[PDB]
Amino acid sequence: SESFVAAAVSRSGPAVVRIDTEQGSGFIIDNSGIILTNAHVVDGASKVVVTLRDGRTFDGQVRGTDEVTDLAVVKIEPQGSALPVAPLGTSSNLQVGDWAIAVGNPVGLDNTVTLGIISTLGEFIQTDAAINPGNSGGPLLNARGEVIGINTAITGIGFAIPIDQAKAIQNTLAAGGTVPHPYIGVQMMNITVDQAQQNNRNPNSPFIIPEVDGILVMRVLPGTPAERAGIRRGDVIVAVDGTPISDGARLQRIVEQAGLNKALKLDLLRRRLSLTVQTAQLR
Amino acid sequence: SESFVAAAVSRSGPAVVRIDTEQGSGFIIDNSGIILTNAHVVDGASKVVVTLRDGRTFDGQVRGTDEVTDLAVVKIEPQGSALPVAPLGTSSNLQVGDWAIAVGNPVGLDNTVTLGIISTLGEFIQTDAAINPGNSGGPLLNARGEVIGINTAITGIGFAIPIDQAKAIQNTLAAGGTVPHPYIGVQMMNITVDQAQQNNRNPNSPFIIPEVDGILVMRVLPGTPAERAGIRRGDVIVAVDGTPISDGARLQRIVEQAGLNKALKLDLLRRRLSLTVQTAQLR
Amino acid sequence: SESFVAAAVSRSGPAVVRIDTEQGSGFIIDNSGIILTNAHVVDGASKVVVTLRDGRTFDGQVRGTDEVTDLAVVKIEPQGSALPVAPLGTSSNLQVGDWAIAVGNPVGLDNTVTLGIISTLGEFIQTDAAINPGNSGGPLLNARGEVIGINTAITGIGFAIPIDQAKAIQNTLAAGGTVPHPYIGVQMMNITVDQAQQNNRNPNSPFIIPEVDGILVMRVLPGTPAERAGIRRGDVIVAVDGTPISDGARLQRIVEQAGLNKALKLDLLRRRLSLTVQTAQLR
Amino acid sequence: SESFVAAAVSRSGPAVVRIDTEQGSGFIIDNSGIILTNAHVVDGASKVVVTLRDGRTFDGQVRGTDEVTDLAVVKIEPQGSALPVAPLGTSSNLQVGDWAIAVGNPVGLDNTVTLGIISTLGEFIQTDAAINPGNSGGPLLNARGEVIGINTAITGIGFAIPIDQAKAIQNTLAAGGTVPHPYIGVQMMNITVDQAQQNNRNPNSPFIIPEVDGILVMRVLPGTPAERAGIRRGDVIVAVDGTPISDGARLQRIVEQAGLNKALKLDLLRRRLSLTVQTAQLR
Amino acid sequence: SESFVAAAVSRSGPAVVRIDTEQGSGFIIDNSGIILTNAHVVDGASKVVVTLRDGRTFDGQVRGTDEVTDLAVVKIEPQGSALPVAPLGTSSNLQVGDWAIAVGNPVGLDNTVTLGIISTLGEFIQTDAAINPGNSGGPLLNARGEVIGINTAITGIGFAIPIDQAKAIQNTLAAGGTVPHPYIGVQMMNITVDQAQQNNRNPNSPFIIPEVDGILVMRVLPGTPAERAGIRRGDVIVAVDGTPISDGARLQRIVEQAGLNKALKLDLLRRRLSLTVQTAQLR
Amino acid sequence: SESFVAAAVSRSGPAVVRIDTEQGSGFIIDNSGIILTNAHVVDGASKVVVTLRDGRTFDGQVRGTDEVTDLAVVKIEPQGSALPVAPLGTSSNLQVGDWAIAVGNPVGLDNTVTLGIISTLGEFIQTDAAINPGNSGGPLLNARGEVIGINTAITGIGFAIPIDQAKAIQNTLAAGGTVPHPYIGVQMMNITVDQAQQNNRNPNSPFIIPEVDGILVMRVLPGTPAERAGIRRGDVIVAVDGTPISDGARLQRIVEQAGLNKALKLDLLRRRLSLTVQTAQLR
Amino acid sequence: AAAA
Amino acid sequence: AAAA
Amino acid sequence: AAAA
Amino acid sequence: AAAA
Amino acid sequence: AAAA
Amino acid sequence: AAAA
Ligand SMILES: [Mg+2]
Ligand SMILES: [Mg+2]
């Protein structure tokens, strides 16, 4: 009698809450009052008001925030009748073209529902389910109604944090404390020989590029480990110690796998030159 | 062989007409030539040109308009082959997630169709079926192809007048004459004690608010019953005579239930003070 | 286990390629490396880089372009493992409300997918599947996954070149050489007696219109066959030699049916006056 | 010890007043309280507040306004110590390069003074003395300090109403009643044979111009004597009855010399055609 | 052989210097290297480069800044040939209409000169000598070439700090240390009975005003002595202890005459209510 | 009886003409019909219409144009009563503060006059005489009424081409043919050691600068002698062959003194490197 | 903020 | 372009 | 308004 | 409107 | 263009 | 910044 959409909303929609600080959506993932949302919803504030789809309101505490993934965990006081819960799916099962249901609780008295598909996977989910404020921080449901992502506002193309990312961040955020995001601080670019010689053909390019294939430092962000290690705009990173490289993403993964406060040795041309960068926490 | 969308369009689409004055969509709801549309389509004009999906054109008369609900009824001369009709569904059956098909006849020779869901119910319907001009004033269909709303142009979020609203307005508009919309003329706001004391903590708030829970008059619109009864920006309405109040919507419903040209007694603080407001017709 | 969307994408998506010149999407229609796309994707450039969904890259040659239909054919060198292919459907079977799947390969490593319906048919296809850059030049699929159109970027309303148009243009573009688009060069308008007298009632209309029904020349584009034949803004075309006319579209079809470098005799009022226009190729 | 500017200001500046309605400058021209200013200063208001450079304030009555010349006369109650007066010079003595002193009383407690020259004479005076609000409606002084114009706000180029114009309007405005400004209501243009043939060479000019020298009606303003006499955009006026013409200004002067409610016979081509226009009062 | 302008520039222009920090004008007022300028020229920087009209450059020290008057004193090392000096005039002799010469040294190798008059006196000087950057911080000269003001950039109307103001600030700024600017922190307005009743006639005015004549607090700036003393938007100040008041300027002068860290007793209506405000230093 | 301004205008103003092409001012410098103006007035057109202050019109020929100095010479046919002439002064006598009179003939029937001073000398004259279109191409007069410059439109600061520049260009332009403007095509900058080390302290500066004092090539304009000689953005020019250099202006003068089609040897660092640049004509 |  |  |  |  |  |  209902479509499958009406059904998925009937399964997970009750757990979708309104969040105000003086604004957006969240959803309860545990009968004890654990609530996921976006960090930009809760601001840097720590006191939050949670309104359930049924009208119950809760003084909820911001238990804290990952600015980088844009996730926050709120907790509320599970008094009275039991808090309803959204069942968590898994995002490593998404294919492009799978149905996507984005649910909000902007007002507090009703869900907002929009319908789309998974448009892209990276690790942001992309969907053409209309993703708008108020609806942001609410869940992205699959056809069965399992949370597979967290809507984020930021065309017809909207983004969701894949739910398995939140699953990894949940314990840490819910218990205060900082999710580690190690970085060194360079804007980088993969450099192609055709591209280095191309660049060098132009009398007005800013620097001569040493004709190789590597990682061109485009910018050294101020106050970063990379500035402190003496990296300059124009350096070409070629290998992280040992392993050669030409892929900005492979360097991303070596930095992350390294961890916080680890020296990395870097092979760069400028002249040949290796430096050590002490990873620090992205903020 | 068709989707269910192609089907619903084949059932109701023939009744979807083009409306020009020198512009938008409508749809025929009776073999006698009764046509619904938006008021902003037909303007304040009274002569309208109706083009059927098959190409027949009719001198149609604007039989008149509710500015407040944004509905108008046109009538055309049902000569020749019978006018086709869109069957009316009912909007008190809509759930969020029910399929929504928005149909226009911008050109006159074809329908425009877009597909979405019911995104919200209040009493505007909200849908993520693309709702654009030309398509505005056409019908919003359910999965079976029953008119459940009237598209109105005004994100990815579009609005429809629920069809049962039009059903109530139809007789009255089709027979000339004014739909009653009683009001008093205040912009109001529910005031929360935490909120009154909050407001009073700020040296620069415009007025001190008497610390209660009620209905804060934010603005007295000029030339309204509320201006004539002496209401001022800053008054706190507390009860309509007898019954206490803190909800702008409950006051809305007491005003509407009252009717046109009825005295209401009002309890407000400013100092304590009750006034009588003679409801008048919104224009 | 998948929706029908995931399925159609699994059938045609592998043939959807990324096109860069220093940007957009295309798709392979033949194991020999014939690729369709938009002309605005490939620019006036002739060297293009094609990236397959699997990561293989090909030096592809722009084999050339119809600016008017906005179609271009690229060819790549079908080495190694066989190029995958999108099966071509047929667009003369589209109904409004048929499902529409728009697929891109913006990155080169994955499809982008959006879902909608056929919103309009003329002969541009209109769809509410989000149609955005990068996705432009990729295919528009039916529910079975047959290419039925070519996405073009240019609301919630997107356009696709119907696939049968490309089918007619394919041989010609793939073998270099120009698709014929004969025109004469006037901006025209159908003129209604009610409309000519209407226009003549206004003291400030630019010209008096001879009260008839025909084709009002609004503008004579510079350097066109119509300028060379002495047509002026304000002329009313009434017949193409013999057959009377009042429809700008019927004149369009007589001009096209005529061919390149054909005299047409024209009946116009200005005074009565017939002229001959030598059709030339639109550029 | 002073410059000549300080001197002229000491002679006429005391008579320069501030005008507020809830704004600009004026100046007293008679010990009985006659004050000149701009019409846009006093609005359509009739109650005005006059502040003298010494601080005395007067309830002043707007005695009324010529919108076309932008002049208004205020009168105040000459009680107490005698009102000071600005002596009127004469503007038919201005040469370009004569010194120009623009004086305001924006605040009420002091003059504003700016210095320039007569930059142009027509019959607006143009000056490069900074002419700004507040200063508008104040007098424009010659080197001796005689009012030679009335500043009007509207580059480094400012305008003044020449004082002899005000001298002609003064009696009439000061005694209520309307200054006559007869017009017929056409936007016109002198048409040059080189120019008519020029215009006729362009396929896209709006109308063919009859190759002569005359007065091309560019626009017929709505609700004017010219619309009522049937004049149309595109007519070429050639003579006013008898005397031939090609100069929009000569027609201006024949219309003005004619007076209010006078028939004029007009010779125009469209076809040859003469019409009679009943001059009416410009508003 | 020269005009009087060329002469005044020959007298004071050599002392007009260029000031760069990585920009504007100054002028030397003492053979020991004391230089006046605008505060917005020197920023909050303390190292400044001074270029004399002859080309000598000096490491000059910002000796410090009054943000409120926008004056700063730089000192340079008077080595070699003697620094040239601008003689200081006096600004309490200015009349409106006195000649005004604004001199800059934007480049360092030449003066910029513009010519105007004193347009207004308050205590900013207003002049129609073009006052532009680069020229700002340079001197405003009288006809004899005495500095009578300091140009400040911020129409055809420019401002200068009257030189006697700088004369009072000079010792203090040149010797480091802060010029005292005592304030309490209210945006105020003189309130007129006609005006209080006027305001009270409007249903939408923010507060009822007690019908008197006084000083209406429009705004209480955050973190000011007035916020700390509990003043609120809407209070009407009537007297400073003893003396009644209705003039925002008279209150300004009582606050300034009071000094830094002085209690003032205030008579206000809100209800009648007196408060004490501890003046603090404006920043 | 007149000011000195009225006088200077009476001496030179009659020779100030209106120039239209379908616009600006010029002035006659010889009874034979030689007229100076701005190049941007006459466009690239060669037929021009000259209107004298008395109303005589002349078919005038553009005899041609220096885009770089923005000067053009028109010639007219000196029939009938003798053309009036503006006497040429000399601009090497200008001091800052000398009076400046800018005269136009925008309409053709009257001069426009504005008054100012010489504000700056370089070799553009700067003046605060309002310089606006229409007035552009007219003469800038000294107090005696000698042309000392040519107004150019392009604040309160206007520019004039010093008259001695035109005197040098006159013969050449009046006789057709191109004024030589030799260049090499670099955007350059003087580089200061404090500045090179400064630049090198920033991790994000585009290139390391070799710590010296010279001429930093900021940009190599496309298709210039400097591009053809292999100069690159970032080179530091140190000497032109022999003589060392650090001044962009000294290089300007060596290039100009060199002439058209002359090799210059250049000393630059990049690595040490000298190149030869063949000067070509600026266009 | 509602209008009644 | 003038207005009469 | 069409283009032919 | 003045600031004190 | 990526940030590491 | 000058052009030579
Ligand atoms: Mg959609
Ligand atoms: Mg000036």
For chain A, which domains are there? 1-177 (2.40.10.120), 178-283 (2.30.42.10)
Q: Mention every residue, 6+ apart, whose C-beta is less than 8 A from residue F242.
A: none
How does DSSP classify residue A157? -
Amino acid sitting at position D237: I
Contacts of A225 in chain K (CB under 8 A): none
**Active-site residue set of E:** 40, 70, 136
Task: Quote helix, strand, coil % in chain B, to nearest 5.
Answer: 20, 35, 45
**Closest C-alpha among A83, A99, A109 to residue A140:** A99
Structure tokens at E114: 């513009």
Residue indicated by tokens 């004017």: D224
Q: With an 8 Å Cβ cutoff, are A251 and K3 in contact? A: no
Residue indicated by tokens 């200008």: F94
In angstroms, rounded to a whole number, what is the distance separating the alpha carbons of residues D40 and D173? 15
First to last CA, chain E: 50
How does DSSP classify residue E66? E
Query: What residue of J is the nearest CA neighbor of E181?
Result: J4
CB-based contact F173:F63 (threshold 8 Å): yes
**Which one of F67, F68, F187 would you mutate to disrupt binding with L, by most L Cβ within 10 Å of its Cβ?**
F187
Q: How much distance in Å is there from the Cα of C38 to the middle of ligand 1?
A: 23
In angstroms, rounded to a whole number, what is the distance separating the alpha carbons of residues E96 and B189? 55
Q: Which long-range contacts (CB under 8 A, 24 or more apart) does A221-227 make?
A: A221/A185, A221/A186, A221/A187, A221/K3, A224/A183, A224/A184, A224/A185, A224/A186, A224/A280, A225/A183, A225/A184, A225/A185, A225/A277, A225/A278, A225/A279, A225/A280, A226/A184, A226/A185, A226/A186, A226/A277, A227/A185, A227/F203
Helix (H) or strand (E) segment spanning residue E228: helix E225-228
**Active-site residue set of B:** 40, 70, 136
- List the alpha helices (DSSP H) in chain D: 4-12, 39-42, 163-174, 193-201, 225-228, 248-258
Residue-wise over E149-175: b if at least 16 C-beta within 10 A, else e? bbbbbeebbbbbbbbbbbeebbeebbe
CB-based contact E265:E275 (threshold 8 Å): yes
CB-based contact E128:D117 (threshold 8 Å): no
Residue E158: nearest ligand to its CA? 2
Reduced to 3 states (helix: H, G, I; strand: E, B; else coil), residue B118 is strand
CB-based contact, B225 to chain G, within 8 Å:
no
In angstroms, rounded to a whole number, what is the distance separating the alpha carbons of residues D69 and D37? 11
**Closest C-alpha among B144, B116, B157 to residue B11:** B144
User: Measuring CA to CA, how many Å separate D124 from each of B283, D38, D161?
Assistant: 47, 14, 5
CB-based contact C182:C280 (threshold 8 Å): yes
In angstroms, rounded to a whole number, what is the distance separating the alpha carbons of residues B261 and B182? 8
**Closest C-alpha among B13, B54, A115 to residue C128:** A115
In angstroms, rounded to a whole number, what is the distance separating the alpha carbons of residues B117 and B95? 9
CB-based contact B49:B1 (threshold 8 Å): no
In angstroms, rounded to a whole number, what is the distance separating the alpha carbons of residues B241 and B265? 5
**Closest C-alpha among B2, A146, A127, A98 to residue C10:** A98
Q: Mention every residue, 6+ apart, whose C-beta is less than 8 A from residue F258.
A: F182, F264, F279
Q: Out of B9, B132, B156, name the one closest to residue C96 (CB).
A: B9
CB-based contact C204:D233 (threshold 8 Å): yes
CA distance E113 to chain F (A): 5
**Angle, CA B279 vertex, CA B274 and CA B283 arms, to 5°:** 135
**Alpha-carbon dihedral A255, A257, A263, A265, rounded to 10 degrees:** -60
Q: Out of F97, F99, F155, name the one closest to residue E9 (CB).
A: F97
Strand partners, A65: A72
- List the alpha helices (DSSP H) in D26-66: 39-42
In angstroms, rounded to a whole number, what is the distance separating the alpha carbons of residues B262 and B280? 8
User: Measuring CA to CA, how many Å separate A60 from each of A21, A87, A163, C140, D269?
Assistant: 10, 21, 22, 47, 83
First to last CA, chain F: 50
Structure tokens at L4: 């030579």
User: Measuring CA to CA, how many Å separate F90 from each of C222, F25, F114?
Assistant: 50, 20, 20
CB-based contact D58:D33 (threshold 8 Å): yes
**Alpha-carbon dihedral C268, C269, C275, C280, rounded to 10 degrees:** -50
Chain centroid offset of residue F37 CA: 12
Neighbours of D4 (CB within 10 A): 14
In angstroms, rounded to a whole number, what is the distance separating the alpha carbons of residues B66 and B169? 8
Structure tokens at A162: 């894949």
Q: With an 8 Å Cβ cutoff, are E110 and F119 in contact? A: no
DSSP state string for A107-146: SSSS-EEEEEEEEE----EEE-S---TTTTTSEEE-TT--
CB-based contact F19:F26 (threshold 8 Å): yes
**Which one of A68, A187, A282 would you mutate to disrupt binding with K, by most K Cβ within 10 Å of its Cβ?**
A187
Structure tokens at E119: 């347009």
Query: E strands, D31-164, where?
Result: 34-37, 47-51, 57-66, 71-75, 99-104, 112-120, 125-127, 139-141, 147-152, 158-162
User: Measuring CA to CA, how many Å separate B278 from each of A228, B4, C48?
Assistant: 74, 51, 75
Q: How many CB pairs under 8 A join B and C?
A: 55
Region for residue D257 given its phi and psi (left: phi exceeds 0; alpha: psi -120 to 50; beta: otherwise)? alpha
In angstroms, rounded to a whole number, what is the distance separating the alpha carbons of residues B178 and B176? 7
Q: With an 8 Å Cβ cutoff, are K2 and A255 in contact? A: no
Q: With an 8 Å Cβ cutoff, are A114 and B155 in contact? A: no
Q: How much distance in Å is there from the Cα of E97 to the middle of ligand 2?
A: 13
Q: With an 8 Å Cβ cutoff, are F189 and L3 in contact? A: no
**Closest C-alpha among D194, D121, D96, D202 to residue F57:** D194
Neighbours of C257 (CB within 10 A): 9
First to last CA, chain D: 50
In angstroms, rounded to a whole number, what is the distance separating the alpha carbons of residues A209 and A200? 7
Residue indicated by tokens 């007789």: B171
User: Measuring CA to CA, how many Å separate C158 from each of C38, C129, E212?
Assistant: 14, 7, 65
CB-based contact E5:E113 (threshold 8 Å): yes
DSSP state string for F105-136: -SSSSS-EEEEEEEEE----EEE-S---TTTT
Contacts of I4 in chain C (CB under 8 A): 183-186, 188, 248, 251-252, 255
Contacts of C110 in chain A (CB under 8 A): 96, 120-121
In angstroms, rounded to a whole number, what is the distance separating the alpha carbons of residues A279 and A255? 7
C70 is catalytic: yes
In angstroms, rounded to a whole number, what is the distance separating the alpha carbons of residues B211 and B236? 10
In angstroms, rounded to a whole number, what is the distance separating the alpha carbons of residues C94 and C119? 10
Structure tokens at C60: 């592809």
Residue-wise over B165-196: b if at least 16 C-beta within 10 A, else e? bbeebbeebbeeeebebbbbbbbbbbbbeeeb
Structure tokens at D153: 């706000």
In angstroms, rounded to a whole number, what is the distance separating the alpha carbons of residues A86 and A81? 16
Chain centroid offset of residue C274 CA: 32
In angstroms, rounded to a whole number, what is the distance separating the alpha carbons of residues B151 and B163? 10
Contacts of A231 in chain F (CB under 8 A): 203
CB-based contact D83:D111 (threshold 8 Å): no
Neighbours of D243 (CB within 10 A): 9
**Closest C-alpha among E2, E114, D113, E136 to residue F116:** E114
Region for residue E234 given its phi and psi (left: phi exceeds 0; alpha: psi -120 to 50; beta: otherwise)? left
CB-based contact F147:F91 (threshold 8 Å): no
Q: Is the dihedral of CA B97, B98, B99, B102 positive or negative?
A: negative
Structure tokens at F89: 């002064």
- List the alpha helices (DSSP H) in chain C: 4-12, 39-42, 163-174, 193-201, 225-228, 248-258
In angstroms, rounded to a whole number, what is the distance separating the alpha carbons of residues A129 and B128? 9
Helix (H) or strand (E) segment spanning residue F6: helix F4-12
**Closest C-alpha among B193, B233, B241 to residue B216:** B233
First to last CA, chain H: 10
Given the residues C12, C25, C66, C70, the one annotated as active site: C70
Structure tokens at D200: 């006729």
In angstroms, rounded to a whole number, what is the distance separating the alpha carbons of residues F147 and F90? 8
Q: Mention every residue, 6+ apart, whose C-beta is less than 8 A from residue D116.
A: D99, D100, D102, D127, D128, D129, D130, D158, F114, F115
Q: How much distance in Å is there from the Cα of F112 to the middle of ligand 2?
A: 15
Helix (H) or strand (E) segment spanning residue I2: strand I2-3
Chain centroid offset of residue B190 CA: 23
Chain centroid offset of residue F221 CA: 21
**Closest C-alpha among F154, F89, F88, F101 to residue F124:** F154
